[PDB]
């Protein structure tokens, strides 16, 4: 009873797992003269609310509410213009002077979260309004630059179709296919790489040749480099209240050994997924272009590549049976690893099946992807009214019948 004084003083958070149920049941049924009253008293006038609540909880089966009502009834809870003019309506936090690490209005604070996927949970970063607008002007500049780009396939369906048809012809011809999947693309990249890339670039104008200065871009990218992310609290109680874990060890090393409890994380290389997609896209595109140019000049074999900012595909058109070229593939892997483009072991580098955006292409035809569409149709019953549900089922069935599934199956879905 008294242990709430030394511990947290909130009576509404007292857990029932610390005390037995028999003691709670028998304690609430003890003597109480001024803490209970006769009758239910549905009118409930002001001044006697606790007594009515205690009576209503006692007449019911549950006694934990009665116990906490008894606990709270017993009172166990016991002339310059720059300093004097910043409190009425003055917007002191307006961004007017900024440094390389902040903007006089925060530090681009972020929040971590999850999003469920079929394989493994995907990272997610939520931004406050200021950092949202800042990263969003970065986004707009980067989509502009990538719209100037030609080989990118992230938001241009024409180039995606060109890549698809080139892939189909390549498979039909006997082209060399390299479906590259990059591991840890998000948590490995750092803004400083983009800083160096944009510092070394020129970004020439179409007609003026004026060599646009990206000073604002550099400053905001430095801001992004100096972003701070706040850890979710739930893991904070999970680790504080209390199997060997490295992050749990780091927490156990950093509650009072160096400072206070960890609540804000700050480091060099984060590149929050969902925040710098297109800048990383253009960086990967130009790096892959450099690599394919190097392959052309070294191994006299003709490369083409398509990149989607997370995975890429490279077609190798060969002069003049597939065991004489492991060396250049290892060389390309080494050079990519020299850059910040580590390749996951899931990449397949032969010439029978090609992969891009989960759309396999094989000699002669294309995989129907039946069971994926069937499972998608069976799931995601987004129900508000029957009419919209019929519309959604119709759309999903159209998508399913597009990839040659069957028509004796869609009838069963309709049934």
């Amino acid at each position: 009873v008294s242990l709430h004084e030394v511990k947290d003083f909130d009576p509404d958070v007292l857990p029932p797992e610390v005390y037995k149920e028999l003691c709670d049941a028998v304690y609430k049924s003890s003597e109480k003269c001024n803490f209970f009253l006769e009758g239910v008293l549905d009118v409930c006038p002001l001044g006697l609310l606790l007594k009515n609540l205690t009576t209503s909880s006692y007449v019911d089966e549950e006694y934990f509410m009665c116990f906490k009502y008894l606990l709270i009834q017993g009172h166990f809870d016991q002339f310059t213009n720059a300093a004097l003019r910043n409190l009425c309506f003055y917007s002191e936090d307006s961004p007017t002077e900024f440094t390389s690490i902040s903007s006089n209005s925060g530090n681009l604070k972020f929040g971590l979260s999850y999003k469920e996927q079929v394989g493994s949970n995907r990272e997610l970063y939520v931004g406050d309004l200021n950092t949202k607008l800042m990263t969003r002007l970065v986004e707009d500049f980067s989509e502009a630059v990538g719209n100037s780009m030609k080989y990118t396939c992230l938001n241009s369906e024409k180039e995606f179709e060109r890549a698809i048809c080139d892939m189909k012809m390549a498979v039909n011809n006997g082209d060399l296919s390299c479906s590259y999947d990059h591991s840890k693309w998000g948590p490995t990249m750092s803004p400083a790489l983009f800083l160096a890339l944009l510092q070394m670039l020129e970004l020439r104008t179409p007609v003026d040749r004026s060599k646009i200065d990206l000073d604002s871009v550099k400053s905001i990218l430095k801001w992004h480099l100096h972003k701070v992310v706040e850890v979710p609290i739930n893991v904070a109680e999970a680790y504080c209240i209390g199997s060997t874990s490295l992050s749990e060890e780091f927490f156990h090393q950093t509650m009072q050994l160096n400072g206070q409890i960890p609540s804000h994380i700050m480091s060099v290389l984060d590149m929050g997924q969902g925040i710098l997609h297109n800048t990383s896209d253009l960086y990967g595109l130009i790096t892959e272009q450099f690599l394919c140019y190097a392959l052309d000049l070294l191994y006299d074999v003709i490369p083409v590549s398509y990149t989607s900012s997370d995975d890429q595909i490279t077609l190798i058109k060969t002069p003049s049976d597939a065991a004489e070229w492991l060396e250049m593939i290892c060389f390309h892997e080494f050079l990519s690893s020299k850059l910040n483009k580590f390749v996951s072991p899931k990449s397949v580098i032969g010439t029978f099946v090609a992969e891009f955006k989960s759309r396999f292409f094989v000699m002669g035809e294309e995989t129907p992807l039946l069971t994926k569409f069937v499972a998608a149709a069976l799931h995601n019953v987004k129900c508000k009214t029957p009419t919209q549900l019929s519309e959604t089922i119709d759309t999903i069935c159209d998508q399913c019948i597009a990839n040659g599934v069957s028509t004796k199956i869609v009838t069963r879905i309709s049934k």
Binding site: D77, F79, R85, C88, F89, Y90, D93, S105, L129, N130
Partner: protein, 144 residues
């Protein structure tokens, strides 16, 4: 003074609903010097805005701009050594307190910035006042 006397003439369309309205009005009209008028004009406009906002919600205007400790010690209540903070509007009834801090921001980003800052600086006070004293309910009135 092409606009100073113009401002004095055109600010006459104001209702002195409260005593402090006239108290600040007479001081403003009886003082024409380059350095103060902007300061007390801003403060009178802010006082009008906060008065509208708080008597929108059963106000008791803080004409003294004093701390929470003294207003809690006005009646019989022990001092828990509360951290200092200046309230805009207070209403205490029985053993309860209702706190209202209002502001105005024409741009959204600054509006939620001030809202979050005020909410954070008013939440932390409950953990100290509840331990050895009475409650409070913090309400924030933000006007765009």
């Amino acid at each position: 003074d092409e606009y100073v006397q113009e401002l004095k003439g055109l600010i006459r369309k104001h209702i002195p609903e409260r005593c402090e309205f006239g108290h600040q009005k007479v001081t403003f009209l009886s003082q024409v010097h380059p350095s103060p008028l902007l300061t007390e004009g801003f403060k009178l406009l802010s006082s009008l805005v906060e008065l509208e906002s708080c008597e929108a919600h059963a106000c008791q205007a803080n004409t003294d701009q004093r701390f929470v400790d003294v207003i809690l010690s006005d009646n019989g209540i022990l001092c828990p050594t509360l951290p200092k903070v200046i309230p805009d509007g207070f209403k205490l009834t029985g053993k309860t307190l209702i706190l209202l801090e209002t502001f105005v921001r024409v741009n959204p980003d600054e509006f939620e910035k001030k809202w979050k800052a005020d909410m954070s600086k008013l939440l932390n006070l409950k953990h100290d006042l509840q331990k050895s004293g009475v409650t409070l309910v913090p309400i924030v009135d933000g006007r765009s």
